[PDB]
């Protein structure tokens, strides 16, 4: 977290996108950050979400917005435990800036992802 903070601290200077190797490194970076995020102590959960939000807000060009992991996050049934929360918070994170939630370009078809969302509603 300190390395990603000190490298994102200089916008307008050494842009991470456009580099023909750091693109395919940063996608692995972003998917790892989206993977390991939960952390049952509530206080640094918000810091993890803030690091993800600042990352997508600053990079924004090498897109690679990864699906089906949020779908695995919120597709879980049995409405007694809040295991679907991370999917909708992270979808709000990717939605609230830009970048539409278009499913059927890489992941699943659009006709079922929205239904999964409405079904957990």
With contact defined as beta carbons under 8 Å apart, do 27 and 62 qualify? yes
With contact defined as beta carbons under 8 Å apart, do 99 and 63 qualify? yes
Three-state SS sequence of the chain: CHHHHHHHCCCCCCCCCCCCCHHHHHHHHHHHHHHCCCCCCHHHHHHHHHHHHHHHHHHCCCCCCCCCHHHHHHCCCCCCCCCCHHHHHHHHHHHHHCCCCCCCCCCCCHHHHHHHHHHHC
90: exposed, middle or buried (Cβ count in 10 Å: 0-12, 13-18, 19+): buried
Find the discontinuities in the chain where C to next N exceeds 2.5 angstroms and give the residue preceding each.
none
Which approach determined this entry?
cryo-EM
Q: How far from each other are the two terminal CA atoms of the chain, in whole angstroms?
A: 33
120: exposed, middle or buried (Cβ count in 10 Å: 0-12, 13-18, 19+): middle
Q: How many residues in the chain?
A: 121
d(C-alpha 11, C-alpha 14), whole Å: 8
C-alpha 98, offset from chain centre = 13
Torsion of CA 121, 107, 100, 66, to 10 degrees: 100
């Amino acid at each position: 977290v300190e390395i990603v903070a000190t490298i994102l601290s200089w916008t307008g200077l050494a842009t991470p996108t456009g580099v023909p190797k750091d693109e395919v490194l940063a996608n692995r970076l972003l998917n790892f950050l989206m993977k390991h995020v939960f952390h049952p102590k509530r206080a640094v959960f918000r810091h993890n979400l803030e690091i993800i939000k600042t990352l997508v807000e600053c990079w924004k060009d090498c897109l690679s917005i990864p699906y089906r992991l949020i779908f695995e996050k919120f597709s879980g049934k049995d409405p007694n435990s809040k295991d679907n929360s991370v999917g909708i918070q992270l979808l709000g994170i990717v939605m609230a800036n830009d970048l539409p939630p278009y499913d059927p370009q890489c992941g699943i078809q659009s006709s079922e992802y929205f239904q999964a969302l409405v079904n957990n509603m």
